[model samples]
Target: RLFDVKNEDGDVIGHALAMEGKVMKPLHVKGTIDHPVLSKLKFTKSSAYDMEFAQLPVNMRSEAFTYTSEHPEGFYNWHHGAVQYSGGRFTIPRGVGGRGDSGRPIMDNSGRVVAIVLGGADEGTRTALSVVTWNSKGKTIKTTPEGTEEW
Candidate 1:
């Protein structure tokens, strides 16, 4: 069976769901988080889609992160931490993969997703992804620091 989800406005932002329902993840956060930004869906409708999303500690300075693709292509962001989908249908930006989970989540007991422990360090090279947070007012806190800079 298949299902299609919609927002309050009833607009489709990609299926992002399946038989069981709920965002599939845990260790698969890195890749899946980037889905919202993803241009398309891979391995869906049936195809060869194998993907791996991980965090590369940019420059290794205790700051910064970058995204990596198993098979390089133009993608916005996503998740699976490092796994395969079955086969070659691809999503441009897997929203679930956007999160640079080279770290953890910065949440309070309130259970609100206030901040994320994002960013990555790959090899000797490094870069930083923007840190997205939400306030009590529900405003976005997008901050991408510069080289050796604080957020």
Candidate 2:
């Protein structure tokens, strides 16, 4: 599954989703998902048509958060996180190709989601994918440090 962005004129200015499954190799994040300059606009329709929105469980719905700001092509600075320990499990699987299980969530003292965990050393290098969070405002926010660097 993938997501794309276009200008007001419908020109493909950037791609928000990373591609996997024989189309493109794996991608990594380096810095912030929100760009200082390009992430300051308002979009009309930021859509995810062919992605696996259904794969997300009902309880996990809140685990996915949206962003209020707009970003450039590959910016993701939304605030959300997955559970750290569940029935003795540490790392969880996210996205299509078994990616996005590197970091933990940035939580408050009460264990609330302040920000999501970001990059870690790749288990190997087999083109894995990660699930990123977006919002109703048409913004895909990546708060992970690696996410910011990728853009």
User: Highest lDDT: which candidate?
Assistant: 2
Which stretches in model 1 have alpha-carbon errors above 4 Å? 1-103, 120-130, 146-151
User: Model 1 scores what on Cα lDDT?
Assistant: 0.27
lDDT of 2 by residue, 1-151 (tens): 1233344455433233212111111123211223232233232221332122122233433444322222222212223323333221222234312123222233334433333233322323221123243344444443322222121
Tell me the RMSD of model 1 versus the true structure.
18.7
| Residue lDDT tens for model 1, 51-77 | 122222233223222121232222222
Model 2, clash count? 15
